[PDB]
Structures are given as C-alpha cells and as structure tokens.
Symmetry: D2
Subunit: 360 residues, 4 copies
C-alpha cells in the first residue's frame, strides 16, 4: 500500500508528514493502526539531528518516528489473548540474541546496538503510520476499557517501573526499611517537574515514600494542583533545598544538579539516574564527593528502558490511578495534535507535560 506516515531521515534529522510505499508481508501475525502516539525528548532529538545512534531500517532512506504508542488491532492470527478491535501497547525495544535478550530482558541487553532494536529509533519503523504489522508477543493488551487515551502513557511509565525494580534489587544490600518494616517517612526526591518526574512521583507514593519534585524555578498552578492531589510536595531548590534524602531520582541529566543532591543522600541511600542531557555542562567531582558516597554505602544506578512485564505493570497502575484521581491523570496529556502539526517536534505547546498525536 501507499499510506500516510510521519518520518525522519535518521540520524540526519528533519520531519515530514507525507505518504510512503509500505508493502504487506505475506507472513504476519497482526495488523494494527495507531490511535495515539506520545512524543518525548527522544523524538525531538531525533528530528533535530542530535542523536548519532539512530538509524533507518536496512535498505531504506527514512524512519517512521514514534515509539510511545496506543494502537488497535485491525487483524490478527489465531491466539488466546488478542482479537480484532482490542487496543494494545506495542513493545519499543525488541530483543537480539544476548543472554538477557533471549529471556525477554532486552532492556538489560548485554551488547547494546545491534543486538537490540527500538521502534522509531534504531533500525525499525515506528508507529506514526496508518498501518503497522507485528508479532503478538510484542503487544501488551489494554484490559481496562475505561482508560482510553490514558493508556498512551504506558510507554513512559514502564521505564519508571523498571527503575523501581532496580531500586528493589539494589536496596537489598542492607535494611532500607524502618525498624517497623515500612517505608513510612522515607524521603524520595525527584529532580525535575516533567512527564517522567510525575510518573516517578506517583509510583513513589504508592510505595509509601514522602515525595518531593524539585526544579530550579516555580511551577504552574496547574502542575501544583496535580501534585497536591497525589500528596506530592514541590520545592524550588534555589529557594528551599531538601536534605536527608533516602531515594534520589534524576530526570534532568544535569551533573551539577545530580551531585548537589547526592551530597544530601542518607546512609544506604539510592540514586537512580534516568535523565539524558548530552549537552549538560561538566561539574567537578572531587575526592570528598567520592568519600561521601563510599562512607555512606550509597548506590548510584543508571536505568534505561523496561521489559514487557513492566508495560503490564504500568497499565495496572494507570488504571488504579485513573479510578482514584481521574482529573489529575487526564491533565497529564496537555495537548493533542493532528499528524500535520509537525512543529510539535521543534516547539513545545504551552505549559507542556505530555503532548500526543491523535491519529485518524
């Protein structure tokens, strides 16, 4: 078929909503179309030419962008789990052959590129196109019919879930809990006030932390209310610096900010590094900074992507939260765009949290 798609020339950049030749494989398990597609900094970086690791699939001269997808099943081979008209979230990362990839933890690929591949990013077409072919195993079923568009948030939230898995694994190094066995009063601070930070914060809340998002500027009454609704605090760190931190999560990617907060981490504290900012400036880490980490048995863990199981978990949390605080969750999606509006990739709609593309 000829079909519509939003494409880049990876890694060169640019973006055009335009038509393309894309033939059916004789061999397919499932055929789908896109309902919603979220966009994040990674897409904007792709478009902007800022990411040297991205590439078009083999023997092609464009890449269909889009990896934060909510899709609907048009057609599907015989199976016990999905049927026509079922909504699904498609896996971003797909496995290679490495000891991790082969048990479905391509999120911890031991090789990196080119063992694993990511839809819309590294050698595999994304989801901003009229038709999509895939294998059933790569699709996670949306089981709550009430969520609708909220399900598009699955992809950003699964990364949060894997990060908390990493938290759970490394915090086993000691007794992290209070001596009553609980997390009551343990302090989570999240660097940043964006999409990922919100999702960190809500999960933090469900695990029983006291949570505080932080930024180098005040926030909008909109965001403030959303946080208030979840029982999440906020602080401008130029005005009030949190200390005595048990769980530090960075979404900024900024070193100066990371290390100033690390020097507030308690004994047996855990630092999750999540944010990318290759442009971020150097911050000098000195011997006293190293000593601070050592003497406190602090763990700094970098986390990227997630496994299928974490997509399932993300859907379950999106449901729980939608049924308890619908206005807040709905407010996460702050603009819906038509596929023509390709200027979303260079410019942020006003007061953005999560921008998405409604397809028809």
């Amino acid at each position: 078929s000829t079909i519509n798609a939003i494409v880049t020339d990876a890694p060169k950049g640019g973006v055009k909503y335009t038509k393309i030749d894309m033939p059916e494989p004789e061999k397919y398990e499932a055929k789908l179309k896109p309902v919603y597609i979220g966009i994040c900094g990674t897409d904007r970086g792709e478009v902007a030419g800022a990411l040297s690791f991205t590439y078009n699939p083999e023997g092609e001269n464009f890449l269909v962008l889009g990896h934060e997808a909510l899709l609907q099943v048009l057609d599907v081979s015989d199976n016990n789990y999905i049927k026509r008209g079922d909504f699904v979230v498609p896996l971003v990362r797909r496995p290679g052959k490495c000891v991790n990839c082969r048990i479905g933890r391509q999120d911890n690929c031991s090789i990196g590129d080119p063992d694993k591949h990511e839809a819309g990013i590294t050698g595999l077409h994304g989801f901003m196109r009229d038709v999509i072919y895939d294998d059933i195993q790569n699709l996670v079923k949306v089981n709550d019919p009430d969520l609708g568009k909220i399900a598009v948030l699955t992809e950003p939230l699964k990364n949060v879930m894997k990060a908390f898995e990493v938290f759970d694994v490394v915090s086993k190094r000691s007794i992290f809990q209070n001596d009553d066995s609980t997390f009551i009063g343990k302090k989570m601070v999240v660097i940043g006030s964006g999409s990922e930070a919100f999702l960190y914060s809500f999960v933090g809340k469900d695990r029983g932390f006291d949570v505080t998002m932080v930024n180098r500027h005040d926030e909008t009454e909109n965001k403030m209310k959303m946080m208030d609704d979840f029982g999440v605090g906020f602080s401008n760190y130029l005005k009030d610096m949190p200390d005595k931190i048990d769980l530090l999560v960075d979404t900024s990617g900024d070193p100066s900010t990371i290390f100033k907060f690390v020097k507030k981490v308690n004994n047996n504290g855990v630092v999750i590094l999540f944010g990318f900012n290759g442009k971020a400036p150097g911050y000098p880490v000195n011997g006293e900074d190293i000593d601070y980490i050592v003497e406190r048995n602090i763990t700094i863990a970098g986390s990227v992507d997630a496994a299928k199981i974490h997509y399932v978990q993300a859907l379950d949390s999106l449901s729980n939260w939608y049924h308890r605080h619908p206005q807040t969750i709905k407010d996460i999606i702050t603009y819906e765009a038509k596929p023509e509006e390709t200027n979303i990739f260079f410019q942020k709609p006003k007061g953005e949290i999560k921008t998405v593309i409604k397809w028809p």
Copy 2:
C-alpha cells in the same frame, strides 16, 4: 594501670609511643594482648590531622591507634568458642541501635556517627596497646594454626569480602554471567597496586574473573611476580588502557582515574567505589558521562567496612591461599616494624605492600 600504647589526639594529629593509664577491670569477658597490628592510609591520615571525622573517646584527650589486628587471648570467661592462648581478630566497627546495627550489620549503619563506633578511629581506642579488654562476640577466632602473622590481613581483606557481597547483590539486576552460567572471561580491573588492590584481585580470581591491577607508573618486580603467581595481570594505564570492563573496583579515591575507567565499563557492568582521598582534585563530570552510565544500566556502589561474617570469610580465604601459594602471601607483609619506629606513620618502607607492627 599503666601500659605502653601508640596514641594520637584525634582529629588534630600526632603520634607517640608512650606510657598511658587505662582502667583494668576485674570483671571482663576477655583480656588480650596484641601480636601484630597492621597499618593503612587511614592510620597515616589520622596522624597528619587530615581526617576531621575522627575523635577521641568521651572525656579523653588521646586515642590509641590501630584497627588491623591480630591478638592473643590472655584470659576469658568460660565459653564454647575461645580459650586462653587462642589467636583472634577483633571487630573494628561496633554496633549502635539502628535497624542495621542491631542485626550485626553495623557496616551498613543507617545513622553513621554517633550510632556506630570504630576502634582506633571514632571515639573508641584501638589495638596498639599492651592490654585490651573486649566481649567475646567482638572477636573472630583464628581456626588455622599454620597462618601465623598472615592472619593479620583479616581486617583489610574483610572489606573486600563485603564489597563483593555488594557486587553480588547489585548484579542481580540482570544476567551478569555468560550464557553458560559462569564468569569465565569476565573482566575485572582494579585501580591501584597497593594492599587492598592485591586482595581484591585475589578474591576476583577466586570468583572466576580475569583480573588486571592498573596504576599510573610501572611496578616493582616484587609485585609483578606476586601478581604472576596468582594469575593476575598488570598494566600501567598511561601505556595500555584496559578496555571493556565488567567489574571495576577503585582503591585510588581519585575522580579522574575513576571516571576515565567508568567510560570503559560494559553494559550491566559494576563499579565499586572503595578508596577515599578527600584531597583528590575535582574532575568535571558532564552530561555525556551520565548518559554513558544510564544507557548501559551500570551500577556504581560505594562500600565501607564489613560484618563479622566477612571476617570469618576472610580468614578462610587467607588460609585457602596460604596452603596454595605460601610465599607470595608472606610477601604481602613487607616490614615488621617495632612500636617505637613511629616514623612509619610518616614514611613508607621501600616497596611497601603491608607494613605491620610486631608487638612486644
């Protein structure tokens, strides 16, 4: 009563072999004398007045030095475990009241000072003194009569054992091993060529790694032959940069060296921060460094101290090693000084690996 002791005034500095008065209780669990006491950069740090976290015990104006000890039991209340004559290594770190401290994991204390205390470092006298009283529970019996003074390596080595427990905990985040279940071919790089570096290296070979110590200068042939007898490599990184590192351990405390090597760590790799040097110059860590860690799901863990179980493990390894490689082990101890030679806190013996005090 009056006894000989080697003392300082923490944190100001100074060292004197000298006469002091110390209570001699008539009620005690155990009474001991020192046979050998080891020294390490912490001892040298305290005496230069370079460590501002050290203090003397409450209501005193000196601090007996020495935390790496082998002691002999003079007398002991009746018990199932030790008797008069036996050799023992005393716990350096003594528990407070925290959740970690109360299960004998004071190495992981949730509070720090003043919950936990360290013999010879923080508010508790050390072992460089003619007489010592202690509880039996704080002593680890040497079960092997052929070890002799090698048992004095128990204390620096127990730190290694806990760092490896930390490795084992955090490496559970992914499959770290080969797809045959082993560590065959996994690569460990230890920054430094000093005593802790050797002991890390030896435990790593036992684990199954291929190991390379590294430093910014060439090494004496004494050390080179010691490495060779254990199958440990060596390389001077200003000439051959090791690459593709699965486990990295730093004993330097130096930021620039640490981060230089962090950029060679593979996916799912682990970095143990161990060494500390508060005067080490700042290294600028930038956005791309952070990214490197994030994208590879790397863990950077600070480790300090160990529990009693790690002393027991350390003695078991010392004795596995000794009945396999007698001479290279003996060769770890490079100078048996006399209590009065207190210039050793200022001045390193030529070719120092481990200097020990031989106690009268």
Copy 3:
C-alpha cells in the same frame, strides 16, 4: 472501669459477651474502640478449645477475642500520623527480642512463642472489647474514606500479601517467568473457596496468573459470580482435576488434597502452605512423591502472619479493588452480626464468606 467485651478462657474456650475489669494502664499512646471485627476458623477453633497453643495473658482468668479489626481512635498523643477520629487496623502480632522481631518482622519470629504474641490468641487481649489501649507503632491508618467497613478485610489480606512475598523470594531460584518476562498463562490453583482463597485469587489475578479456586463440591452462584467478576475460574475437582500448575496455594490444611495437587505441579513450581487443620487425617507420602518434588525442583513453603508493611499493602489493594469493582468487594462481607449474637462462633450464615461483627 467496667466495659462490655467478648472473651473466652483459652485453651479450654467457650464464649460469653460479658463485662470485665479493664483498668487504664500507665503508659499508653492511644485509646480506641472497635468499629468492626472480622472472624475466621482460628476464632472458632479457640472457642471449641481446639488449639493447644492459645492461652490467657499472664495472670488473668480470661482472653478477649478478635484479631481482624477496624478500630477508631478516641484519644492520642501529639504525633504526625494519627488523630482523634482516624480509623486504624491494629497489628495482630507484636514483637519480642529476636533478630527478626527487632526489625519488625515478628511474622518471621526465630523463637516462636513466647518471644512474639498475637492479640486474641497468645497471651494478649483481642479487640472485641469496648475500650483498647495501644501504642501508635502498632496501628495502621486507613487513608481511604470510601472504604468504610471494607477495611476490616485488611487482616486476612495481609497474610496473603506476606505469602506472595514468600513466593517472590523463593521463586528466584530459577526463572519462573515466560521468555517474554511476563507471567502470562502461568497457572495458579488455590485449594478452597473461602475468604482467604478469594483474597489469594484476586492477588494472583493482579500478579498476572490464570487463577482457578477449587473444591470437593460446586459453589453458590453468589460465589461463582464474584469469581467471574474478577476473572477467576472455579472447578470442583471430582468433576474436573486441574493440571500443570505453577503456583499451588492451600487454604484447606488437608494433606490428602495438598499432595494430590502437588503431583500436578510443574518444574520450578511453588507450593504455598497456608491453611491449617489440626484434625485432618494423614495421607501417605511415598518415595515417588518425594522424587516428584526433587526432580522438578519444586519448593513447598509454609507461611504465617505478616508484617506491618503488608497491612499497608493490603489497604492499598482494597482501595484499588473497591474503586474498580465496588459492587464485588462489598459482597465479600456476607453478614454484619451483633456481639450479642454469638451463634456465629458455632454456625455459618448461609453461604458466608466473611462474617463481620458491628460494635455497639
């Protein structure tokens, strides 16, 4: 002070809804009264005189009953957690001094009786008594107002939460998940159709298993439609005997049943032993039964009670379940009885799953 209270004389037993002398003890942080109190087979066994291990507090002729409780606070000290008016679930098990109690894991008491004590079973007065004094540490706050009397279920659920924590720990022996990383299609069978079974089935369902409860007879369309509403299957194992089980949980306590179902467990299966029936006759375990277990690497884990953190989790679960299936959870509590009505300790309201007691 005189108060109305239902009590017994353990281990002999028998119930009367009397009044008794309960003086206001010296040191106490909270004064409570019972709103609702659940009951179960342990409360009935206690009345019969069925249970060897129960007994009365030191030097008292009687024992207040009830361990499944929702309670309201009447007065409390200045604190950041609870106030006049908040409703709470109280800890059943209160810790002794062993390595596990002292970290708040008295559910894993290393000593057993008399280190730990259970309110209403082992030397500590239960909660069916007009006034209750307690420390704030032993109280769990209900943070959801819509829950009302649902929160009575916190105690039976919290045992289920601990059990699934045991499953999580022990199933690490091997990769339990599918090669996609998920639990999709893994088969949980819960032996029995009672209240704990329902609570296991719902949690199973949230963990991603295909769940079937089973029994030796068909079940009330009342029960069958709750199962159906959650997506839990049912089967009577005289008509159909389920096969290829990955997680087998017993609420029956009956050996013959446990072991017939153990013989259907797959490789790497986990068996949770939960229910206890001291009267159940013997079933003959032979050589081949053992071999079945050995060659399949199966784990059989007994589980009892739970820690505070699991009371919190059980509360979060009820709030999530309530807000998504309000009608079905509500239906779990089948009868609100009055203290006066003490037939309940001998007889079941028709097709009763949970029987609550409303307090005057």
Copy 4:
C-alpha cells in the same frame, strides 16, 4: 571404530562391559578418553531396571553408562582454555531450548524431558567408553594438578553446590543468621552417611554450621574418623535423634525419616530434599504435620542437578579440601575397580563411600 564401553539397555536394566562402534562424527571440537568414572545409586538403579525415566539415545539399542567423570583431552580445536593433555570434568546435563536451558541453567529446565538430556541417563551416551567427543563449552577444566583422581568427585559435589545456592535463595525469606551476622552454632543435620552426605557436611562446615550426619545404624570406623577430621558429628538416630535443626538435608529418599526430622526443624528452617527412592514406602502426614510447617515459616525445597558454575565451585572446594586434609579426602575414594568388575553395579563393596572405575 570399535571401542570398549560399559552399557545397559535403558530402562530395562542389565549391564555389560563390551565392544561397540563409535564412528568419528564429522564435526567435533574435542576428543577425550576417561581416566576415572565414579558410580552412584543412579547407576545401580539403572542397571537394576528400577528407573522409569531413563532411555537409550535415538535409534540405538543400548546406553553407555557413567555420568561422574574425569577425562583427559586427546585432541581439541584451538582455543584459549584447554589444550591436549588437560584434564576436564564434563557436564552431565545438556541444555534444551526453554528459558532456563538457554542461559545455562538447564539444571532448572522448565520442561523436564525431552528438553534437557543427561549423559548416561536420558537419551545421551555416558562416559564409560574409550573415546568421547564433545564441545569445549561442556568441559570444565581441572586447574589444580595435585588433585589427580580426587577430581572425579566433582560431579557429585556440584549437586551439593547447587543445593546450597537453593538454600541461599530461600533463606532470604527472613533473617536466618545470628544477630552477629554469622552462622555460628546454627545446626545442619544430614540424613544419610554416604558420599553425598559427606560432601553436604563438608560444605556445611565451610559455611560455618555445626553439622551432624545421621543414620539408622552405627557407622564404620573409617567413616567416623573422616567425620572427625572435618569436625563433623554423627548419630545413630535409633538411639539419639538431633533436635533444633536449622538446615536439614536428606540423601535417603525415605518419607518416614524425612517427615520425622521435619518435626525437629526450627522456625525459618530449611529442608533440602535431595535423595530419591521410588520404592520407599508411604508415611502418613497429617494435619498437624502440615501445621508444624506453616507455623514455623519452614521451606522444603527439592533440588536436582547443577549448573556449570557449580562444577567450577566444586573443583575449587575439592582443592581447598585437599591441600588441608590430604588423607581424609583421598579416603573418600574407597574402591578402584576395573571396567570388567561389573559386579560393583550390584554389590556395594564393604566400607563404600565412593567406588570408582579406573579406565584402562
């Protein structure tokens, strides 16, 4: 070519030392002969026709016996690890395709037969034959040259190493250690006094348990002296049954003995099921037995086979054991037979711990 081999007809039984044709396959990485092959209850069970699971390889009328082997490399493709003349221990279990097999954890195969296969047991020729072809990856190199024939104990010891890994996983359900962090004074009881019991006991001692083997008769003086050389105790439980057991390992396969000792296990105790005897008679387990397990948070784990990493751990233990207790370890091997002494598969020569065939 025509070679000698010891063969059975599985599962029918029978044994004979005879000639067979072993063609040189087209592609092989390694060519080996046997130096020693250990025999165990499984080999005798096969030859007796008593094992239903065993089968001949595809399209053959016989099955070469022997799975406990030490081999010498006659020829091998060039590689980094083994060369001509090296001694190796080969893997018994070879992987299939399931999620555990493909990470080298076929010891935990999720399918059972015919996914995994066992040399000498299940559709794959054993090692009692003059020539053997294999892949390098399936061979574990003997690095210590003084071990000699002691290395043949690798295969029964790696089973123990895996069972201790299973112990390490399951005992994380609570704090199993003392409040000093150690295992000092924890009690391990091993049901049985054969070679597996001894290897369990030696590892138990190295783990820091107090260990006692037990049987239903007194033991010979050789065995008693060996226990004594390692500090392992013994008891005829007809006369004196150990109580207060923290870790119970069974090597008998006998239900009656198992369940009787299960009733001595402490809170948080672990029972490893290891031995198997399909012929052993039923023992009735009642409601009270089950409740004992539940109320004590006891785990009962069946354990079979091992992974490659556990063959390597086994060889490191056998070296550590050999360089400390030379004659004791040599004495585990109690009869060296000739291949034609097929009588050893039917009669336990007098004093047996481990019988081996020295291959001509």
